[PDB]
Amino acid sequence: AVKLKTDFDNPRWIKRHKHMFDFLDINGNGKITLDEIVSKASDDICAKLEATPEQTKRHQVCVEAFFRGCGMEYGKEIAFPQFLDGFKQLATSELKKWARNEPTLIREWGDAVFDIFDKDGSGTITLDEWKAYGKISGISPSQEDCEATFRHCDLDNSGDLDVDEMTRQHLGFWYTLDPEADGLYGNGVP
Numbered sequence: 001a002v003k004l005k006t007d008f009d010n011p012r013w014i015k016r017h018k019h020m021f022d023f024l025d026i027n028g029n030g031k032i033t034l035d036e037i038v039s040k041a042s043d044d045i046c047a048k049l050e051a052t053p054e055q056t057k058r059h060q061v062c063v064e065a066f067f068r069g070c071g072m073e074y075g076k077e078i079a080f081p082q083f084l085d086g087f088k089q090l091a092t093s094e095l096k097k098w099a100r101n102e103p104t105l106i107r108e109w110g111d112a113v114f115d116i117f118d119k120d121g122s123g124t125i126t127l128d129e130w131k132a133y134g135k136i137s138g139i140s141p142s143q144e145d146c147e148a149t150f151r152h153c154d155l156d157n158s159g160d161l162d163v164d165e166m167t168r169q170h171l172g173f174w175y176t177l178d179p180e181a182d183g184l185y186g187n188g189v190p
């Protein structure tokens with residue numbers, strides 16, 4: 001039973017996103033742009049994961065939608081406070097879709113990442129594949145933290161992760177500060 005109640009004023013939820021913001025703020029001037037974010041997704045991440053042009057584009061579209069959901073746009077610098085209020089709007093919009101049994105932006109982003117890793121048609125992500133993602137995206141480079149993610153989640157009998165489980169975890173991790181989601185990224189993200 002995922003937590004659907006928001007906790008936007010919680011110091012821990014704020015710090016989780018402040019951590020992500022600072023992680024995306026390259027030169028550390030206290031601001032980020034959609035340009036820099038999409039570049040990371042397409043020129044860096046997708047390239048190293050050897051995604052096809054179509055997979056790269058699908059992934060790009062998902063990222064653009066996720067961050068535009070935070071009020072971000074190309075050519076505009078965003079400061080943390082504004083980024084955070086934007087994230088609160090994305091979160092409520094996502095929870096509304098969840099309440100309507102409509103696919104969320106984080107679920108669709110997940111589908112795009114999972115497809116890039118869908119080779120033998122496993123339709124899932126293995127520990128090694130996630131380890132690669134953690135390193136290439138930079139969100140969780142430590143092998144230990146990636147192993148912590150898999151120990152944290154409910155895996156199938158083969159030890160692989162499925163998109164519904166990751167979506168479920170992410171909804172609680174990014175949006176509602178679900179106690180069940182705490183620890184999702186080991187020490188990689190608070």
Ligand SMILES: O=C1N2C=C(c3ccc(O)cc3)N=C(Cc3ccccc3)C2=N[C@@]1(Cc1ccc(O)cc1)OO
Nearest residue numbers: 017020021037040041063106109110113137139166167
């Ligand atoms: O969830 C994810 N992320 C959340 C945030 C993020 C950023 C700012 C916030 O305030 C909060 C969260 N940043 C990145 C990393 C990234 C950023 C920009 C472009 C590409 C990648 C990121 N990568 C994901 C991708 C993913 C999505 C669904 C899945 O099922 C599996 C994997 O795996 O962690």
